């Protein structure tokens, strides 16, 4: 089932956003070099991107997009269970975003697309959950 | 750009402080007034003192040059600091003394506090990042 939602803003702060469950708090994450280096940290069902520059930003969230991202800043994939109908996406007290991601096991592509590149002319974070 | 990391060295923090100092150097302890205080450190001579949140254990990281950005964090300060002889040390009062290898020059000295509850190492945790100018 392919679905895209409109551009949501979000104020980025810590160079950081948390993808996590629906009814859970997220846990404290261990930023090693390696985590850092690799572009995020993954904990109990969520994981945080680093992000380029603490701005307000836009998260373009996607499900099994059939667009391709060509060209970007930084990509990192990384594997992403979901246990209730549900995701929320947010920063270091920024406002907290919700999508209707359905319940089961996805790849999370997270495209940095900087605003000098993106359509939206603003630091867009591309985030597309392909069903596994 | 001449990068280069320090193992992490445990520093026992007394009176809510310790101080970045050149290598044959005696620095006095400062007057951490409120104003000092809520700046976060207290300079004087070729010396800064940096502001600790507790007297406890705590995890001095030292670096060079670093691009890897610091995700957790209470307080950043960040200050102009001339090394007047390859080598500083790092000191609080009564703790063991750390040594560190950094040529003479120009730098701006950044310090991020990341309290046990933020840090990988379950203890206040440091960081100083010496970045070349």
Redesign the interface.
Known sequence: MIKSWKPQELSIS???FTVFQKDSTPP??????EA??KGY?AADGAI?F?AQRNTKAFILFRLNSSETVNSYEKKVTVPFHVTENGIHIESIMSKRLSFDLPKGDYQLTCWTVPAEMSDLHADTYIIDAVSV
């Open positions: 810590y160079h950081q404290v994450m261990d930023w090693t070099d850092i280096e940290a945080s680093e």
